[PDB]
Design a protein. Structure first.
Lengths: 75, 76
C-alpha cells in the first residue's frame, strides 16, 4: 500500500506502508527520505494531528492518502 | 442465454451470453455496459474466481446464473 507525504519543502514523497503501521513507523520512513528525525516530526491528516502509538487504520488512512509533515519545534 | 452480474453495491446487470463464451468475452460485455477495463475486473461464481481462458460451461454456468463483479482497486 502507498501513501503520500507533503514534506517540509512542499514536495511530495511516496511511502510503502501497511494498514497497521504505527505513526512512529511512518515517521521512521519519513526520516529516511527527508532527514527530519521523528522527534521533530508532526504528522497531519485531514487537518488532524496523528499520535505515535496509533495506527494508519485507526485514522482510516487508506491508500493514496496524503499526510502533511510539519516541524515540531519545542524551544 | 442470459446471466446476471451483481456489483458490490447490489446493482444488477443483465448480459446476453453463450455457453462457450470465454471469461474474457464476459469481461468485454461488462466493459461495453459499464465502461470498466477488463483488467480491473474479477468475476466470481459460487465463491470461485473465474479465469481468463476458460469458458462459462467449464464452470457449469447456465441460464440465470449470477456472477459477482469484484473490482481491482485502481492501482492501489
Ligand atoms: Cl453472445
Ligand atoms: Co439468450
Ligand atoms: Co428459470
Ligand atoms: Mg503496497
Amino acid at each position: 500500500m502507498q501513501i503520500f507525504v507533503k514534506t517540509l519543502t512542499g514536495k511530495t514523497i511516496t511511502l510503502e506502508v501497511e494498514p497497521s503501521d504505527t505513526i512512529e513507523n511512518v515517521k521512521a520512513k519519513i526520516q529516511d527520505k527527508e532527514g527530519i528525525p521523528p522527534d521533530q516530526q508532526r504528522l497531519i491528516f485531514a487537518g488532524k494531528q496523528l499520535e505515535d502509538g496509533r495506527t494508519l487504520s485507526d485514522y482510516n488512512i487508506q491508500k493514496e492518502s496524503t499526510l502533511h509533515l510539519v516541524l515540531r519545534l519545542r524551544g
